[PDB]
Design an enzyme around this catalytic site. Structure first.
Site, mmCIF file in Angstrom:
data_model
loop_
_atom_site.group_PDB
_atom_site.id
_atom_site.type_symbol
_atom_site.label_atom_id
_atom_site.label_comp_id
_atom_site.label_asym_id
_atom_site.label_seq_id
_atom_site.Cartn_x
_atom_site.Cartn_y
_atom_site.Cartn_z
ATOM 1 N N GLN A 10 31.624 -0.632 64.291
ATOM 2 C CA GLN A 10 30.976 0.639 63.985
ATOM 3 C C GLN A 10 30.078 0.553 62.753
ATOM 4 O O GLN A 10 29.002 1.148 62.718
ATOM 5 C CB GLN A 10 32.019 1.746 63.804
ATOM 6 C CG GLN A 10 31.431 3.137 63.618
ATOM 7 C CD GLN A 10 32.489 4.227 63.627
ATOM 8 O OE1 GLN A 10 33.688 3.946 63.612
ATOM 9 N NE2 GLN A 10 32.048 5.480 63.656
ATOM 10 N N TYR A 11 30.517 -0.196 61.748
ATOM 11 C CA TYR A 11 29.773 -0.277 60.498
ATOM 12 C C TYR A 11 29.223 -1.669 60.201
ATOM 13 O O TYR A 11 29.449 -2.220 59.124
ATOM 14 C CB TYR A 11 30.625 0.223 59.328
ATOM 15 C CG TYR A 11 31.114 1.641 59.508
ATOM 16 C CD1 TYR A 11 30.222 2.704 59.532
ATOM 17 C CD2 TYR A 11 32.467 1.917 59.653
ATOM 18 C CE1 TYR A 11 30.662 4.003 59.699
ATOM 19 C CE2 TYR A 11 32.917 3.212 59.819
ATOM 20 C CZ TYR A 11 32.010 4.252 59.840
ATOM 21 O OH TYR A 11 32.451 5.545 60.005
ATOM 22 N N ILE A 28 25.871 8.451 55.922
ATOM 23 C CA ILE A 28 26.446 8.047 57.205
ATOM 24 C C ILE A 28 27.274 9.185 57.818
ATOM 25 O O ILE A 28 28.155 8.950 58.646
ATOM 26 C CB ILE A 28 27.322 6.770 57.082
ATOM 27 C CG1 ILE A 28 26.842 5.876 55.937
ATOM 28 C CG2 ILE A 28 27.325 5.987 58.391
ATOM 29 C CD1 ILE A 28 27.631 4.591 55.794
ATOM 30 N N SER A 29 26.984 10.418 57.412
ATOM 31 C CA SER A 29 27.669 11.588 57.962
ATOM 32 C C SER A 29 26.705 12.753 58.184
ATOM 33 O O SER A 29 25.611 12.779 57.619
ATOM 34 C CB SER A 29 28.835 12.015 57.067
ATOM 35 O OG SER A 29 28.390 12.345 55.764
ATOM 36 N N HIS A 124 39.476 7.605 60.005
ATOM 37 C CA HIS A 124 39.772 6.216 60.332
ATOM 38 C C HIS A 124 41.233 5.881 60.045
ATOM 39 O O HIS A 124 41.750 4.864 60.508
ATOM 40 C CB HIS A 124 38.868 5.268 59.536
ATOM 41 C CG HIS A 124 37.416 5.368 59.890
ATOM 42 N ND1 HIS A 124 36.902 4.875 61.069
ATOM 43 C CD2 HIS A 124 36.367 5.889 59.212
ATOM 44 C CE1 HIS A 124 35.600 5.095 61.107
ATOM 45 N NE2 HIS A 124 35.250 5.710 59.989
ATOM 46 N N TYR A 152 36.245 14.701 60.642
ATOM 47 C CA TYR A 152 36.326 14.976 62.070
ATOM 48 C C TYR A 152 37.723 15.467 62.424
ATOM 49 O O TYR A 152 38.720 14.848 62.054
ATOM 50 C CB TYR A 152 35.997 13.731 62.902
ATOM 51 C CG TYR A 152 34.520 13.427 63.040
ATOM 52 C CD1 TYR A 152 33.565 14.211 62.407
ATOM 53 C CD2 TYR A 152 34.081 12.363 63.819
ATOM 54 C CE1 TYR A 152 32.215 13.933 62.535
ATOM 55 C CE2 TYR A 152 32.736 12.077 63.953
ATOM 56 C CZ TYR A 152 31.808 12.865 63.309
ATOM 57 O OH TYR A 152 30.468 12.583 63.443
ATOM 58 N N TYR A 167 36.360 7.989 73.759
ATOM 59 C CA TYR A 167 35.606 7.997 72.510
ATOM 60 C C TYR A 167 36.514 7.801 71.299
ATOM 61 O O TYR A 167 36.238 6.965 70.441
ATOM 62 C CB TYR A 167 34.817 9.302 72.385
ATOM 63 C CG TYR A 167 34.336 9.616 70.988
ATOM 64 C CD1 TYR A 167 33.251 8.947 70.435
ATOM 65 C CD2 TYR A 167 34.956 10.599 70.227
ATOM 66 C CE1 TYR A 167 32.806 9.241 69.158
ATOM 67 C CE2 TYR A 167 34.518 10.900 68.951
ATOM 68 C CZ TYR A 167 33.443 10.218 68.421
ATOM 69 O OH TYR A 167 33.006 10.519 67.152
ATOM 70 N N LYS A 239 28.609 14.989 71.222
ATOM 71 C CA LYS A 239 29.094 15.682 70.032
ATOM 72 C C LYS A 239 28.637 17.138 70.006
ATOM 73 O O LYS A 239 29.397 18.023 69.626
ATOM 74 C CB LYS A 239 28.671 14.956 68.749
ATOM 75 C CG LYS A 239 29.421 13.653 68.506
ATOM 76 C CD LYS A 239 29.198 13.111 67.098
ATOM 77 C CE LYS A 239 27.771 12.634 66.893
ATOM 78 N NZ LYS A 239 27.602 11.978 65.565
HETATM 79 N N1 LIG Z 1 40.803 2.786 54.202
HETATM 80 C C1 LIG Z 1 39.536 3.049 53.754
HETATM 81 N N2 LIG Z 1 39.241 2.967 52.441
HETATM 82 C C2 LIG Z 1 38.013 3.223 51.993
HETATM 83 N N3 LIG Z 1 37.013 3.576 52.834
HETATM 84 C C3 LIG Z 1 37.242 3.677 54.155
HETATM 85 C C4 LIG Z 1 38.521 3.415 54.651
HETATM 86 N N4 LIG Z 1 38.478 3.585 55.978
HETATM 87 C C5 LIG Z 1 37.241 3.941 56.339
HETATM 88 N N5 LIG Z 1 36.498 3.994 55.224
HETATM 89 C C6 LIG Z 1 35.036 4.350 55.084
HETATM 90 O O1 LIG Z 1 34.667 5.639 55.450
HETATM 91 C C7 LIG Z 1 33.231 5.583 55.668
HETATM 92 C C8 LIG Z 1 32.903 6.460 56.736
HETATM 93 S S1 LIG Z 1 31.183 6.957 56.978
HETATM 94 C C9 LIG Z 1 30.725 8.167 55.691
HETATM 95 C C10 LIG Z 1 30.365 7.625 54.302
HETATM 96 C C11 LIG Z 1 29.848 8.681 53.240
HETATM 97 N N6 LIG Z 1 30.985 9.369 52.591
HETATM 98 C C12 LIG Z 1 28.906 9.690 53.770
HETATM 99 O O2 LIG Z 1 29.330 10.759 54.168
HETATM 100 O O3 LIG Z 1 27.719 9.461 53.786
HETATM 101 C C13 LIG Z 1 32.943 4.197 56.087
HETATM 102 O O4 LIG Z 1 31.906 3.652 55.305
HETATM 103 C C14 LIG Z 1 34.182 3.447 55.897
HETATM 104 O O5 LIG Z 1 33.945 2.266 55.190
#
Ligand SMILES: Nc1ncnc2c1ncn2[C@@H]1O[C@H](CSCC[C@H](N)C(=O)O)[C@@H](O)[C@H]1O
Length: 258
Positions: A10-11, A28-29, A124, A152, A167, A239
Site C-alpha cells: 500500500q505504501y 496521504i489522507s 492499520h 476509517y 477491500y 468509497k
Molecule cells: N504501527 C504504526 N506506527 C506508526 N505509523 C503507522 C503504523 N501503522 C501504520 N502507520 C502509518 O499510518 C500512515 C497512514 S496514511 C496517513 C498519513 C498522514 N497522517 C496523513 O494523514 O497525511 C502510514 O504512513 C503508515 O505508515
C-alpha cells in the site's frame, strides 16, 4: 512484518505518490490540507506546545501544526521510505521531527504531549493494538493534554457485503464502528470523549478528489499509468458509494486526559 507489508504494498514510494496526487501535496489522507485546517480549527496551541503525530506520513500534518502554532511537532511513521520522503520536504526547522518507528514499540515519557494527533493511521492496527495504543496515549498525554483522531470506521462487520469484506481483507485494515471506537477511549479513562460520524463530510471530500482526478487525467497519465488511474478511480468510486450508505465510515475523535 507489519512494516514490511505496508512498505511493499500500500505504501510503496509509487503508491504514495499516487495517493498524494489526489489527496494533495504532503498528504496521504482525505481532504488534504483543507480538512486538516478544519480538524484543527478549535485546537489551541503555541510555540511551547509539544505535538505527537502518529502515522505522520509525508508530514503535511506536522508542517501545518508547526506553521499555525509554532509548536514542536514529533511525527512517528512505521514506513522508513515514507519518512525519507517527508524529511526531504522540510529543511532548517528544528521543531519538526520525523521518525521511522512502530508506534506500538515507541517509548515516550509520561505526561509529555499537549496534543496527540493521528489521521487515518490507527486503522492499520488490530483491535488489541488499538486498545494498547490508547493506553499508551493516555500515559503520554500531559494532564492538560488532548487526543485528536480521524480514522476509517465502518458499520457492524455483520453488515459488510462481498466487495467491502475483500477491500478490508486485502488492506489488512481492522475497521470497528465509531461507537466501539469511543468505548475504547472511554475504557482507557479518557475524559470528555467526543465522537463524530463525519461520513457525509468525508463523502464531500471524496467527490472533490474524484472530480479532480478526472479533470487532471492527462497530467496523471504522464506521471503514472492508466492501470493506476483505474485502480484509483474505482477505489474512490467505491468509497463514495460506501460512505454514502454508511458502510465505510469516517470517525472523528477528540478526548482529554482529565
Ligand atoms: N504501527 C504504526 N506506527 C506508526 N505509523 C503507522 C503504523 N501503522 C501504520 N502507520 C502509518 O499510518 C500512515 C497512514 S496514511 C496517513 C498519513 C498522514 N497522517 C496523513 O494523514 O497525511 C502510514 O504512513 C503508515 O505508515
Amino acid at each position: 512484518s507489519d512494516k514490511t507489508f505496508l512498505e511493499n504494498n500500500q505504501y510503496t514510494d509509487e503508491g504514495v505518490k499516487v495517493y498524494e496526487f489526489i489527496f494533495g501535496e504532503n498528504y496521504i489522507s482525505s481532504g488534504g490540507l483543507e480538512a486538516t485546517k478544519k480538524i484543527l480549527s478549535d485546537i489551541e496551541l503555541n510555540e511551547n506546545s509539544k505535538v505527537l503525530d502518529i502515522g505522520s506520513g509525508l508530514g503535511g500534518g506536522c508542517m501545518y501544526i508547526n506553521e499555525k502554532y509554532g509548536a514542536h511537532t514529533h511525527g512517528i511513521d512505521i514506513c522508513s521510505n515514507i519518512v525519507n520522503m517527508a524529511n526531504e520536504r522540510v529543511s532548517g526547522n528544528n521543531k519538526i521531527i520525523f521518525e521511522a518507528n512502530d508506534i506500538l514499540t515507541k517509548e515516550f515519557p509520561e505526561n509529555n504531549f499537549d496534543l496527540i494527533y493521528s489521521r487515518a493511521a490507527i486503522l492499520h492496527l488490530s483491535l488489541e493494538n488499538k486498545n494498547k495504543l490508547f493506553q499508551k496515549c493516555y500515559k503520554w498525554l500531559k494532564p492538560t493534554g488532548t487526543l485528536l483522531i480521524t480514522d476509517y470506521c465502518a458499520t457492524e462487520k455483520e453488515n459488510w457485503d462481498d466487495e467491502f469484506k475483500e477491500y478490508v481483507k486485502q488492506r489488512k485494515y481492522t475497521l470497528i464502528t465509531v461507537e466501539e471506537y469511543a468505548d475504547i477511549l472511554t475504557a482507557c479513562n479518557f475524559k470528555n470523549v467526543v465522537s463524530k460520524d463525519l461520513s457525509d463530510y468525508w463523502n464531500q471530500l471524496l467527490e472533490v478528489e474524484h472530480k479532480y482526478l478526472h479533470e487532471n487525467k492527462e497530467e496523471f497519465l504522464k506521471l503514472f499509468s492508466e492501470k493506476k488511474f483505474i485502480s484509483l478511480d474505482d477505489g474512490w468510486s467505491r468509497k463514495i458509494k460506501d460512505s454514502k450508505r454508511k458502510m465505510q465510515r469516517w470517525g472523528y475523535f477528540k478526548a482529554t486526559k482529565n
